[PDB]
Design an enzyme around this catalytic site. Structure first.
Site, PDB file in Angstrom:
ATOM      1  CE  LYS D  10      -4.503   0.369   0.510  1.00 47.29           C
ATOM      2  NZ  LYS D  10      -5.334  -0.418  -0.473  1.00 47.29           N
ATOM      3  CB  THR D  57      -3.084  -3.400  -0.656  1.00 47.41           C
ATOM      4  OG1 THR D  57      -4.334  -3.050  -1.258  1.00 47.41           O
ATOM      5  CG2 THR D  57      -2.239  -4.248  -1.619  1.00 47.41           C
ATOM      6  CG  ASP D  58      -8.803  -2.390   3.104  1.00 50.25           C
ATOM      7  OD1 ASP D  58      -9.028  -1.223   2.734  1.00 50.25           O
ATOM      8  OD2 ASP D  58      -9.283  -2.894   4.148  1.00 50.25           O
ATOM      9  CG  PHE D 159      32.342  25.486 -12.321  1.00 49.14           C
ATOM     10  CD1 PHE D 159      32.810  24.389 -11.591  1.00 49.14           C
ATOM     11  CD2 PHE D 159      31.991  25.311 -13.658  1.00 49.14           C
ATOM     12  CE1 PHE D 159      32.942  23.126 -12.183  1.00 49.14           C
ATOM     13  CE2 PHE D 159      32.113  24.047 -14.267  1.00 49.14           C
ATOM     14  CZ  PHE D 159      32.606  22.955 -13.528  1.00 49.14           C
ATOM     15  NE  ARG D 176      29.097  28.143  -9.543  1.00 45.21           N
ATOM     16  CZ  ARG D 176      29.061  26.907 -10.030  1.00 45.21           C
ATOM     17  NH1 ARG D 176      28.874  26.694 -11.326  1.00 45.21           N
ATOM     18  NH2 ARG D 176      29.263  25.869  -9.209  1.00 45.21           N
ATOM     19  CB  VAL D 227      27.931  21.153  -7.110  1.00 43.07           C
ATOM     20  CG1 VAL D 227      26.989  20.231  -6.329  1.00 43.07           C
ATOM     21  CG2 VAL D 227      27.214  22.444  -7.470  1.00 43.07           C
ATOM     22  CD  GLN D 228      31.005  18.393  -9.728  1.00 43.54           C
ATOM     23  OE1 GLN D 228      30.760  19.554  -9.384  1.00 43.54           O
ATOM     24  NE2 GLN D 228      30.841  17.965 -10.974  1.00 43.54           N
ATOM     25  CG  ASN D 254      24.684  24.142 -10.453  1.00 43.09           C
ATOM     26  OD1 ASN D 254      24.266  25.121  -9.839  1.00 43.09           O
ATOM     27  ND2 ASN D 254      25.859  24.144 -11.099  1.00 43.09           N
ATOM     28  CG  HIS D 256      22.121  26.304 -14.093  1.00 37.98           C
ATOM     29  ND1 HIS D 256      23.352  26.061 -13.530  1.00 37.98           N
ATOM     30  CD2 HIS D 256      21.733  25.140 -14.677  1.00 37.98           C
ATOM     31  CE1 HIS D 256      23.718  24.814 -13.797  1.00 37.98           C
ATOM     32  NE2 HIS D 256      22.750  24.233 -14.484  1.00 37.98           N
TER      33      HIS D 256
HETATM   34  O1  LIG Z   1      29.542  23.127  -9.756  1.00 42.19           O
HETATM   35  C1  LIG Z   1      29.449  22.829 -10.961  1.00 42.19           C
HETATM   36  N1  LIG Z   1      29.752  21.555 -11.279  1.00 42.19           N
HETATM   37  C2  LIG Z   1      29.710  21.113 -12.544  1.00 42.19           C
HETATM   38  O2  LIG Z   1      29.978  19.937 -12.856  1.00 42.19           O
HETATM   39  C3  LIG Z   1      29.305  22.076 -13.595  1.00 42.19           C
HETATM   40  N2  LIG Z   1      29.174  21.989 -14.926  1.00 42.19           N
HETATM   41  N3  LIG Z   1      28.744  23.231 -15.384  1.00 42.19           N
HETATM   42  N4  LIG Z   1      28.641  24.116 -14.315  1.00 42.19           N
HETATM   43  C4  LIG Z   1      28.975  23.451 -13.186  1.00 42.19           C
HETATM   44  N5  LIG Z   1      29.039  23.767 -11.877  1.00 42.19           N
HETATM   45  O1  LIG Z   2      -6.040  -6.791  -7.106  1.00 40.57           O
HETATM   46  C1  LIG Z   2      -5.846  -6.614  -5.890  1.00 40.57           C
HETATM   47  N1  LIG Z   2      -4.675  -7.077  -5.406  1.00 40.57           N
HETATM   48  C2  LIG Z   2      -4.353  -6.965  -4.110  1.00 40.57           C
HETATM   49  O2  LIG Z   2      -3.273  -7.379  -3.645  1.00 40.57           O
HETATM   50  C3  LIG Z   2      -5.328  -6.300  -3.214  1.00 40.57           C
HETATM   51  N2  LIG Z   2      -5.346  -6.038  -1.900  1.00 40.57           N
HETATM   52  N3  LIG Z   2      -6.536  -5.369  -1.624  1.00 40.57           N
HETATM   53  N4  LIG Z   2      -7.287  -5.248  -2.789  1.00 40.57           N
HETATM   54  C4  LIG Z   2      -6.584  -5.805  -3.802  1.00 40.57           C
HETATM   55  N5  LIG Z   2      -6.783  -5.962  -5.126  1.00 40.57           N
END
Ligand SMILES: O=c1[nH]c(=O)c2nn[nH]c2[nH]1
Ligand SMILES: O=c1[nH]c(=O)c2nn[nH]c2[nH]1
Ligand SMILES: O=c1[nH]c(=O)c2nn[nH]c2[nH]1
Ligand SMILES: O=c1[nH]c(=O)c2nn[nH]c2[nH]1
EC number: 1.7.3.3
Lengths: 295, 295, 295, 295
Positions: D10, D57-58, D159, D176, D227-228, D254, D256
């Protein structure tokens, strides 16, 4: 401390390309969002402030546009493979490229029953995606997917015979609504490099179309015993129709629609066989996943 | 201080309804999101903590489901009018009801070229909406709309001859991409009450379909001089085809796609006649509005 | 057909400005999103494809940046008034400018208990907004607002004594959770033009701060009889503290948190006085509005 | 075909809990969104329509509320471990539980300089998260994270010295803007089971606070070479301060902010040392990741 893993690049690069047929005047558009992340001998940019190993993310963006200008952008499996290969061939110290592409729908408009040469509609938010991992010495791994395909059937879904214990309140049912947003991924066998990917180009669009078709038909026709059972039937068929796929994965929310008891109001009957008005539930939702491979 | 205006009610009420044809087995689904706000002699709930005048918002929610159970939910113009009328007839001190409905698309699936009896696809995020104001003694005012219709044409749009001064950098163009998300509203002549709305029921779906058709065809076929000029042509046609509409309003973003100069890279030509790869711009966007009425 | 109303311009223009104090080294940043729409004698651009009357939306974008460069961008009431006035003074045929500004929070970071000279945190998604309408011959109308202020109190909210009829299932309560997202707008008396707006500059930030303070304190301290009653108390106080405000409007969702009956499970007590675990409801939600003015 | 992997459960289960101190009258609220996915001997539900192996699932949803009623919900590392352990102990055929929790901020309000006993503000969209994997026979793996922490510094970021080739247009810079949304994850050493997790309970909140503090201080004080380089400094410090963490991962966009050349307009100077007004870019964005572990 030591760098265990590192990757960096450019995300959310929106790209549009138009093809103009000069003979027929027909134009075709493609629009995608692209992410490229690189890995390699770049640890020193993190540990020593050594920027000499960094292909700037701005340059990666430029490269995506240049590559789109000089190559076909369809099928996306091919474009992603070209794009990824570029980086490992161009830069000695880059050893892996990860390319994710989301293709957006621009469907040609029909005007007065005829295809328009240059007008398009976004006919759904459904996407076709690819993830391409190009790893030096290890070939090209491609995962293709469709996502955002939203469907509902109003009957021919059941759910009974599940485990009942002191945590269980859910009633068994032989007739319910079933609705989901389909996310399906098929993973191709590893390819040795670009030449091999090129050799299989026709299979990519065909397999996407087949995966979509099988998904929709199975959903519509299966008298569903559960989401689990229906999704397995889909995956099984896709693997049967394309031998170059190794695995199929589905991830499906169960988007619940609840009955509304109106009997408190003048004995109004709106449950079971009399159920007409339902309350779609925004949350919570079931989430069901499975990965199916070959025996 | 004094209460100058007050309204309250329930928003985001999701509703699904199914119709089951017992003869043919065909099922049809409708899903909407509804908001109802009431006005009337309710000032004392604000100023004196007098809750006796408040129809609880929870009760409004119940009423929406009950009304959906007992009435057709299509066309939404009719359902909204029934729903609004209910509140002013039921509660003496409530003098106006405002009903907003968003209809979500559930399009019947075609499987192997035939319409499926009970399976549906959300084939677009486009909505059909209504706003219905039911005011005691003043009738029923209905505004119908479509929204979220996203289109693009790759040529046959121009923009030249605009004002140029010391704030202007934009170059004139005789060939550009034009893309927008259409929001179009048509306002009906005032109706005297439910009987009159019922008398016009067939016109509602027909006019929605016509508005959609005119929008798409005009967009596709107009060699557009500007968004302003093209949208005016749409509104003019809609007013011509339905005499019970008083005004048509369009609100259109201009979703820009920019050329990318690649000449810095090996003299690559990608501008003007050579433009193939473009950068879709997420923001800013032009926003163009107009309301067109009768002479 | 005829043009009844028309406006056009640029939306979603993101702008950042930095002020650098050269004496102290302290830097202060402002970030906003701006929309400017113009009206005037522009009908012919719609009806005759006459672009000569169009100040291009791209030029409006340029103008916003130029104006931000040459003027203070705070308080936003002043900046919006400068920006709007520019268009009606510059272009003879433009007779109204509508400027909407959303201010985003960049709150100075405290590092080791001291304010940092150039580092900032987005400490909330709450916005401060303005809508400025500059109409030739009619002065400057300013509506100021805060929005996206999300609060919850876990007790000291009641709701009983409301209308009960055959549509009502809601139980009366003397102790509930109350949670909302505050949207509050105060409308200034009309100003004759820029000189008058300038004369009141100190009041703008002060009144925003007061409106915020009154909202929070009243919410926290009122033993609330209803959303209606509590919001009225807020509006009343704001009008009392600033005589240049003509009206105050609040629009408040009631974001419901439901009790969960767990008695089916081993007699577990989780309702009324024993309620500890609740289910927040994403939808539907009450929506309560009021506009308060002077006697 | 065969099932290679399967998990289901669920998602999007919203939960609120209140603690009421009867001595002091102080109330404290917690709100979270929870997802639980199970794995085990459930293949037959997919392949044979065998629902007997399915914990509905209910029922999983019910279990989450019941567990929240009977246990502390803080720190989330503890609650997730209790919740996951429940499923593997209760159901013989369930062998792994995956619990993801997102904690939402409800910060106590200060009114007139004093902490209010029962009123709260969502003071940021920043989240504290946990992912807990409880695997039978293999213990409890916990990854803790903060996300959605949005910061900007207006100077003291550089950069320069990056790779320049025929794909490069980016100019080197010694001053920047740097802005990002921080996503940081620390992975705990494997725990043998609930008793061991309980033994470390005080470390969870302390380590979250330390990770936040180190992130903010390093960001504000580092004269950033990239960033790296800056993110590596953060990870290094966190590993130094908590020996029970095995790895730290940062994922940083990033975001921009571009200079705007205004020199075309009356020689206006707005670049380099004269840059005051900038255009925040919504996309594309750099994306930089690293995982740091121990020597
Ligand atoms: O911080 C950055 N890392 C990158 O790899 C990059 N590539 N373009 N600008 C960038 N700035
Ligand atoms: O098709 C269904 N599968 C399930 O596992 C399920 N559980 N509740 N209702 C359901 N319907
Ligand atoms: O404060 C409230 N006001 C209302 O109008 C209402 N209706 N249901 N619950 C409510 N709570
Ligand atoms: O169609 C357009 N209308 C306009 O008003 C405009 N302004 N810049 N570009 C434009 N395109």
């Amino acid at each position: 401390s030591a760098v265990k893993a590192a990757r960096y690049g450019k995300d959310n690069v929106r790209v549009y390309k138009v093809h103009k047929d000069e003979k027929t005047g027909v134009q075709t558009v493609y629009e995608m969002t692209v992410c490229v992340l690189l890995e390699g001998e770049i640890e020193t940019s993190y540990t020593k402030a050594d920027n000499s190993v960094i292909v700037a993310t701005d340059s990666i963006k430029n490269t995506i546009y240049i590559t789109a200008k000089q190559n076909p952008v369809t099928p996306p499996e091919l474009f992603g493979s070209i794009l990824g290969t570029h980086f490992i061939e161009k830069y000695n110290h880059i050893h892996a490229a990860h390319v994710n592409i989301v293709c957006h729908r621009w469907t040609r408009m029909d005007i007065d029953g005829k295809p328009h040469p240059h007008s398009f509609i976004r006919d759904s938010e459904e996407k076709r995606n690819v993830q391409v991992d190009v790893v030096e010495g290890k070939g090209i791994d491609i995962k293709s997917s469709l996502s955002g395909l939203t469907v509902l059937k109003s009957t021919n879904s059941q759910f009974w015979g599940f485990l009942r214990d002191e945590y269980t309140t859910l009633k068994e049912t032989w007739d319910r609504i079933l609705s989901t947003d389909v996310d399906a991924t098929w993973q191709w066998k590893n390819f040795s490099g670009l030449q091999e990917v090129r050799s299989h180009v026709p299979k990519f669009d065909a397999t996407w179309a087949t995966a979509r078709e099988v998904t929709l038909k199975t959903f519509a026709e299966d008298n569903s015993a559960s989401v689990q059972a229906t999704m397995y039937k889909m995956a099984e068929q896709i693997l049967a129709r394309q031998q170059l796929i190794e695995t199929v994965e589905y991830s499906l929310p169960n988007k619940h629609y609840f009955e509304i008891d109106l009997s408190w109001h003048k004995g109004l009957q709106n449950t079971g066989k009399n159920a007409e008005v339902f309350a779609p539930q925004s949350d919570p939702n079931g989430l069901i996943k499975c990965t199916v491979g070959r025996s």
